[PDB]
Each structure stands twice: as C-alpha cells, then as structure tokens.
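Researcher: Batch entry, complex prediction.
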Amino acid sequence: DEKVFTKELDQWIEQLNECKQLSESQVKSLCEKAKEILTKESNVQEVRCPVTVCGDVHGQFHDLMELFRIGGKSPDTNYLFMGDYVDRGYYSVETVTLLVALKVRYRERITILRGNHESRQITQVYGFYDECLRKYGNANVWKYFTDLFDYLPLTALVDGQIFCLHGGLSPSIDTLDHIRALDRLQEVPHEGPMCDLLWSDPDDRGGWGISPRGAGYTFGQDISETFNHANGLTLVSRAHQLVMEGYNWCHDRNVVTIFSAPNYCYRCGNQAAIMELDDTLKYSFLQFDPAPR
Amino acid sequence: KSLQEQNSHDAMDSYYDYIWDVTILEYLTYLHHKRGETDKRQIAIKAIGQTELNASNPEEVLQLAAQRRKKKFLQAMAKLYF
Amino acid sequence: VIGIRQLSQSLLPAIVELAEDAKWRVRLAIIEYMPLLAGQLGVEFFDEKLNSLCMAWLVDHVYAIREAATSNLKKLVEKFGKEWAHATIIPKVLAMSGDPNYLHRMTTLFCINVLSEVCGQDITTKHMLPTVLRMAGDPVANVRFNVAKSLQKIGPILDNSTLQSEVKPILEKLTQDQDVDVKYFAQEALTVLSLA
Amino acid sequence: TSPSYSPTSPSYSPTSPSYSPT
Amino acid sequence: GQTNRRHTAAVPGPGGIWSVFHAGVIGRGLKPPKFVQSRNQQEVIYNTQSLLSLLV
Amino acid sequence: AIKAGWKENHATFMNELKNLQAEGLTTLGQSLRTAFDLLNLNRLVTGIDNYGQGRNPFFLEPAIIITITDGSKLTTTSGVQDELHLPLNSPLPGSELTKEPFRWDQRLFALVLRLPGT
Amino acid sequence: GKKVVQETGIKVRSREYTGFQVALLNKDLKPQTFRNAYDIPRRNLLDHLTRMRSNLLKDEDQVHSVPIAQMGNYQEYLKQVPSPLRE
Amino acid sequence: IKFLIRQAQGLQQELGGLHSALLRLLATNYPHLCIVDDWICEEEITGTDALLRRMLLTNNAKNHSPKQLQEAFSAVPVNNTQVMQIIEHLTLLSASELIPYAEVLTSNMSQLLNSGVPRRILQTVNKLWMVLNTVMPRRLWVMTVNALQPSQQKYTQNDLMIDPLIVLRCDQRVHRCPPLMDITLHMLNGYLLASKAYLSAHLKETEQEVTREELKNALLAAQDSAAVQILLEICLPTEEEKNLREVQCLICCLLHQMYIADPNIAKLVHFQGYPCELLPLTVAGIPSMHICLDFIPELIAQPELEKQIFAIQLLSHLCIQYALPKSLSVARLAVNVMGTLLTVLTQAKRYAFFMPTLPSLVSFCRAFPPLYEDIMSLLIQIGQVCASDVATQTRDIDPIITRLQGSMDPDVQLCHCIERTVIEIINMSVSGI
Ligand SMILES: [Mn+2]
Ligand SMILES: [Mn+2]
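Model: Structure tokens for the complex:
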C-alpha cells in the first residue's frame, strides 16, 4: 500500500527528472494526496536548520536543474523555495510538478511557500493556464493545481531568527500571532493583509507608500527595524524583485532579497543566487548562471 | 519651560506612556531630535503613533482614555511618595 | 590525437591556476581529466602538488564539484594502489568528519561510499566502519539517514560476522529514532541486507 | 608619553591611528 | 505557568592557505533556551484556591 | 525648508518627497512666509510686476500652493499660538511694495487630515 | 538641495576639559573593515583576519549590497554588457 | 645564518666592513632573528662558571648518543631518573655539539606534559631549547610547532610565516605548564615579526598601489591585536579552576615587550576591549599600561555603550594603581560622562550600562578624596531616578518599604546595586584612613 505507492512515486520523480510530465490521472492522484499532506501545516510552518533558501524560480526547468546541481539533490540538502515558480516560463508545468512531487515524497526535506503568482486570476492571464491547455489539452490539471495553490503555507520561520516570506511586511500585520491567525484557504484577495504579504517590498523611503505594482505596499528601513524589534527576528528573507548579484542586503542588514532564476525571461541575463545556512546558523552564498542547453 | 532643562530626576522616559496630549509629545519629539537623543525620540514617536489617541475621535473614547491615564499616573505617583 | 604526455606537460604550468577559477564548469572539466595526468606523471609528482588540489576540491562550495572529485578519487585509488590511499588519502578524508558544518560530514560519507568499493575489506572495516558507525548518533537528521544509505551500499563488502556483530545494532537503533524519513531508510537498508 | 620611562621617574634635564568616524 | 581561544582551537576552513567557507553570521545564532515550564500541575490548583478564598 | 526647485527634475522631486521624516515643529506661519518669499522673489526677478503702471492681466504667474496638515494647534518653541501670525519682519527687499506677502495670481489650498483612529 | 545632518551631541556638564562631546551614531557609517583596523569588532576578528589575509595574498568591502533601485536596472546592465548577436 | 653572524660578531677586527653589511642585511630582511632576548642570552656572563664546569665535568661521559637518550626517553615514565641523568650531562655541552640532539628532544615533547614529571626535567629542557635557539632557530621553530600540535599536519616554515596563530593551536595542556608556555611565547614573538617581513617582501615581489600597502598595514595591526587577544584569553581561568599565576606572569612580560615595541597595539587592543575580569591582573602585570590615560578620553567618545562601559572600568583600576594629576583630570571627565548618560539613555539600556559600571565608582573614591562630592551627588541622583522609575509599573518586591532597613526585575536589581555600592564606599571611607 504505502510502500508500493512510495516506489511508484519514485518512478514519477525520476521521470520528472527527465522533463517528462505525468499523466492526467497521476496529476489528479498527486494533488489529492498533497491536499492531505499540506492541510496539517499552519501559516508559519517552522523549519529547523540547516536549510538552503532559494529565491524566485518562475518555472525555468533548466535553471532549476542547475540549481539542484549546485545545492545538491533534494533528498540530501533541505530546501525552502520561495514562490513564483509557475509563470513566465516555457516549462512551468514541469517545474511545478517537480516541486510538488518532491514535497509529497519528502514531508520535511523541502518546503514551498506561496508566491503572488500562485492564484486563479494571475495564472490565467500569465501563461500557466495556456501552457496547461496546450500540453494536456483540457483544464482539469489546471483546476487541480490552482486548487492546490491555496493550501500552501504563507511564511516560514528558521530557528526562531530567520523569517522567510515572499513579499514582505504589511501595515495591517504586526506580529507572528496575527500571521498564525490569518486564514489561508482563500484565493489571494486583491486587498488585505494576505494580499499585501505577497506584494510587499523594500525601499529606501521610510514610512509607507503605495506600491507601483498596484497591490501591496512598500516599507521603509525604520518599519523593518521596528518589526524586527517587535518579535525578536534578526533577518527577513524575501524574493520578489529581480536582481543582479542574486542576493542583495537592504535596510542595513535587515532584509535579504534573493533571486534564484538566472537570466530572467531568457534576456535579462542576470546571475542567480542561493543562500544556505549550516547547522550552527552559519550563512553562506552561492551564485550561478544557467546551464548550457 | 520645564521640559527644556536637562536636570531631570523623574525617570524622564518611562513617564511618556501617561502623557496623552498630542501637542506636548510633538514638542518632546522635536526636542529629542534636536538634542540628538534617538533612543527616546523613538519612544516619543511610538507614543504618538498609538491609536488610542488621535485628536479626531468622537471624544467619547478620548475622555475615557484621559481618565484612565490620569488614574494610572496618580496611582503610581501616590505609590512613590509615602 | 596527441599522446598523453605531450599535452599533459604543455598544460601542467596552467593546471594549478586553472584548478581554481571562477566558473565551476571548467573546474569540473579539469577534475574529470586529472586522473590521466596522474597516471602519466606518476605518484611522486601528483603527491608533490596535485594531491593538494584534489583535497581542496573535496571541500568545494558547489555540490557537483564535490561529487565529481569523489568520483575522480575513486579512479586515483585504483590507479595508484590500495596501500597508497591508505597511506595518504584515508587519514585526511576520514579526518574530515568533525567540523561543525554538516556538508563536509556528508562529503565524508559519499567518499566512504565510493572508496569502500576499491579499498578492499580489511581497511574499510578497521578504518571506515568505526567512524561511520560512530557517526550514527549525529544530531543532524540528514546525515543520520544518509549513514543508513551508506550502510546499504557498503554491507555487501563486509563479512557476515562484522555485520551481525556491529552493523545490526546501529541499524536497529536508527529505526528507533523519531524521524520518519530516516526510519524508512533504516527499514529499507535492513530488508535489503536481510540482517533481520 | 614615554611608554617605557614610567610616569613617576627622574626627568632627563638636557596609517589610520583613530576610528574612521572619529 | 509561562571564546577566541576555542574559535582558534579549530579554524581556517581546514585549508589554512585559503579563505574560510562562510561569509559571516546573522547574529548570536542558535537561541539556546527552548525551555519549557513544567514545574508541577498539582497544588497550583490549591494555591489558586487559597487566593480565591481570600478574594471571596 | 526647501527641497525641490524649478531647475530640479521629477526624479529629484520624487526622491526628496518620499525620503521625508517627521521631527520638526508646526511652524506654519514661518513656512508660509518662506514659500511666499520664494514666490515673490521669483516674480520680481522676472519683473513682470509692473508697479506704478497698473496690473497686467496678460502677465501671469499662476501658482497653486497645496499645504497638507492635521489642523493641530500651532506650535512654537516659545509656546502655543492660538492665531496664525505671519511674521512681519521681511529680510527680503521690496516686500513693502505690496501690503500682503502673496499676490492675486497665487492661490493657496489647505488639506486638513481628520481621520479617526478607529 | 543641501541636506541637514544631525551632529554629535556635545554635553559639557557643570556638576578633555570644557570641549568634550560623546559621539552620536551616524547612519552613514560604511566602515572600511579592510582599509582600517579599528573597525572589526572583537567577535568577528578571526573571520576578518582570515578574509583579509586571503584577499591580500590572492577591493575594500566584502559586501556591496546596493540599496538603490539599481537592482532592477536590467536595462543598464544590458547596456554595460556587449551583445552583437544579430540575425 | 645565525651561527655565521654570531661568529662574525665574535671576530670583528679582521672583517672590515663585512660585519656591518651582514648585520644590516640581517636586521632589514630577517627581523625574526634580531630579537634582543635571543642575542642577550648569548653573552651569558663573564663568570666562566659554564666553562670551568664543562672543562671538569665532560671528561668521558660514557658516550651518550641521540639513540641512547631516545631509548631511555621511550620509557621515561617507567624510569625518569635515567632521563634526568642524561639531560644533566647534555646541559654542559657547547652550542654546536648539541645539534645532533635537536630531533630527539623536540620531536618527543608530547609526553613531557604528562602529569608527574618533576619540573626539573622541564626546566632543563627549556634551557637546552634556548641554547639551541641561539644557534639554529629557523629549523627549531618548525620542529617544535609540529611536535606540539595537538593529539596532524606537518606545518612548514613558509606556512607558519603566513598564519602565525598556528603557534597557539597547541595542546590545551600547554596552557598550564610554565616551562613550555615560555617556549611557545618565544615562537609566537618570533613568527609575528617573521610574518611582517614575509608580507613586506611579498608585496614588493607581486607589484609587477597604496591600497595594497595600507591593506598590508591593516592586516599586520589586526594580526598583532588578535595574537594579544588569544593570549589574554589564555590568562582567563577555565571553569574547571572555578601555575596559572606563573603563566599569567609570562604572558604579562611578553605583552609588555609588544607594547613597548609598538603603541598602536595598545590603542587597538583597547578599542576592541577585552574581558574585564582581566583588568585587575593586567593593570599591575604590565607596568607599561599607564599610557592608556592618554586616549581613554578619546575612547569614551565612541558611541558604543560597550566601549564606554569598558573605558570606565579600565579607568577604575588605572586610577587605583596610579594617582597622577592627569589621572584625576580624566577621572573627573568619567563622572561627568556618567552624569550625561544618565540623562540620555532609555531604561532598557540604563540597566545594561549602569549595573556593570557602578562598582567602578568606589575605586574612584578610593583614589581621590577630592573627587568625592560629585560622586555622591551622581550616586544619589541615579538612585532616586531609578526609585521614581520603580513605581511606574507594579513590582513584586516594591523596594520602597526597604527604605527603613535571584532573578528580579532590572530596576530592582539596579537599586540593590546602588545600595551595595553605597555600603561599600562608606566602608572604604571609614577604613581608608
Ligand atoms: Mn516573481
Ligand atoms: Mn512574487
């Protein structure tokens, strides 16, 4: 039963390692199982170090394969990918399938956050829906993956010090208790604390300000400092803004912007970075440029 | 004229909680920033930022808040002496 | 097209500088081709300078390097004799299992998984085993189950006596712990080796 | 002043040395 | 209910003629305590009863 | 008191507008006096102000000054002032030519924030 | 167009003589750990020692961390980068 | 090189300018050989005691050999008197005939640290090591380091000259055996200079601009400072204790020589600050520490509350040991700064800045009766400001009622601290005569 299913899942893992998407029935059975495996994790799904934090992916399968080459194979090096891994990529379906497959195979060797782009509305008008219709013909898999995207956690806490979340802080939210009390079984609303968490970002301003993205806000140095004092956090890690060094510090070593999708849209040519924390919370950094194709 | 001098002896910081008038706190923030005392400038900013008092409420809450802060201050003040 | 020695001598001046450079793809290319140079230039010269480069590669940041370097070290031991490895490589790689970081303690496990293939059985039993077995209690779950993964591969190379004597207690202990994943690997290796 | 001559002693009659901000 | 001696006793990325692996630390690291309050459930009821009787 | 001038660009204006911090005093009279001084300096530098020669409708310098505030009591280091007393000392030369600091072209509008806490 | 910077608090007290001022932290520090030594607080001394030695036997700052929006100037990065590839 | 230069020093009449030129080249390129403590020990005495002793005691010393000593030494714990006898005859030999024994002694210095050996063996081995140091230092230092590595690479001379702190990565049992700590400090002091020379040569070599030079200077400053820091860490007692007095004295001598050699080290070690449990030791151990009264005024100006807390604590012990007009002119500034920080500090930091510095004030009072009324004024002021802050928030001990007289709240701890300090200052004034 469980044993034979585990071996069957192994075949799916190795196949996805070969860029070969699963059958529609297999996708259905995967999503069904993943619902029961994600239902048990609260908003701040605490994860113990060591860890390897990975920034934005945007479903670039070659890049993800090189990222595995760099950091290590999933069963060995624990990972904490942060969102936006379904859009603006010609292999988004394969990427998301691989991520969810790894999550279901290993409950705690990996953990995936929910980015702004994992919702019903955004995917329809940013490719993923089109990709699914082209590949599988119909939209059954689409209505499976979009349904799954709601059950993802919202933020991760590493040894009570590092706070990893895709977007950033929000004027409504102030404490981890509020995040824990937030309800996630809801397509990201267009305005609200949940909305902003997936569209926030840093800036050298101070105070607050309407984000040019049209959703969420933009926080300042003092806001991040005050929030860190409020809850004893020592560093927040987000990945929503494309960068060049791959990892950039802001707010005087308070928020780290990570981005692990090199050469965004195949044309930016930006490098990509990955952060890794050893057992003694000894951060490091690795950089890379996409593998030859 | 009293806040101006530097010879305070009354735990100058801890008492900022009880003060409940926006204007005096504005004066305090200006004074601290000018004299270069950020560790208290931030406390003053927080006290102002507290939502309980905004100088625009229907005053039903403002009077209650002022009464409560008066009670707390006079209670502590009575504890101190005797 | 060009014999080993000619181009090996031609490239020898630039190998060390090339042996460490920005890109990792070129480092991988070199580490893949080094054993030919080792065979061509003999034990002495390699121990003179190349051994240091190999050992430095054994702790490279990236993971592809580490793995390729361990694979290449597999070639080197069989090219240069078991006693040579027991003399030079074993004391250092096996000593690399104590740093606070867990990445290098995983590298040691991979290296043991690879070398135990070529290094006979007595040397593995009196050098590799004791350390691998003593590592079973490491607080890190990752290494905790990857030790079982290594035992699975290394079990066929022991003698039934050593296995049933010392390996079985460690493997059954692994099943006792609370981490589901390491428990599953422990069961898998136990059934693969048919120790119980 | 005179690091080796001691402060209480008969007197004989006849490149960043500071903190960066300071 | 609710140093340098050791650091240099082992250091240098095990290479010695090369830099160190990590690029720094984020803070004190490994908040040690993770300590729970489990003094005793019993007789806390009775202390509460005493206080409650005094209030009554 | 001044952040962005006429020769300044939108980028600099954005930078200074966004990077502001609140630590001063509500010296509305002095601030308005400074703003009107800048405007009148510009208007006499241009020279379109045909003093003693009528007022020219064609010569126009339409400026709108939007002030933003909470409407709180006026504050001054000396103390609280209950009335908007615009300072009468004018170091800027030529102020006497006009009784008021402002002119007919410039218009001032004030925004008073009154948002309840709850 | 001139910014105002808070000054170091100067506190001469009537209870190294009459002209002393305890320094007040300035945000724009940007300490050059490599160029100067009185930085590098005690805790990270071993790390920065090894890192400086490597950097030399092999620049002034180990972390760049540009806070500008320049992180999103893929245009300027492209203009820096040559690309003569044309069909 | 060392042997030949000593021979040339001995013979000066013949070699006209060769001696001068050689000595210049040595002192300019090889500074780790021109360490005065090495050449001074060469002059010994003119007492002829060693000569007369050797002429009448060497005789035929039953043909002692390196292998003979090695045989006895492999079973030294079983038989120590044999080793004593062998090395006792070793001591008499001249500086040359000893070289054949360099490996035997240096290689096998591990088990000497084992408990039980009477310290005469260690003292004699130290003396022999110094004799060999006066002859062949280059080889000897490498031998000793690779022999004293903990229980194992084989460090090279070029390796050690890069990272000399490798010297201190030795058996922790070394830090509690006086005779070998001496040798370790000798090596450390040599190799720091050697590293300076190595970097200076390396930069000139690789030049094929200033940025590099001041990078070199910064590296050297930090390197010396770190060496001093680990040395002080050694002086700190280990929890097990909660010999060390001899070890601290030797470290004190070495630190004194470094401080006289360069002041900037004094200014840097202090701006980094070091564990303040050591102040009572160093202030007296290092007689060339009075210089601090120069820059403490600069130190206090630093924003870091940690640095200021350290500065006041240091000034406390300096004032006790030295009582000079400059010391008082700075002690007054100390109290003024404490008064200022009283006004400018929130409570969360007021506790952290006043609890570990108040016991400093009794030292000021002990040193300077004139600087007394200011002390008492500040003490009463801080006392009653803390008392006023106490009432602001409910407490469980309520120290107010204690007027007529564990892990508590910060303010209660602060008030108890002030009470203890006042008791202590009253006692010191009563018994201060
Ligand atoms: Mn994205
Ligand atoms: Mn996003």
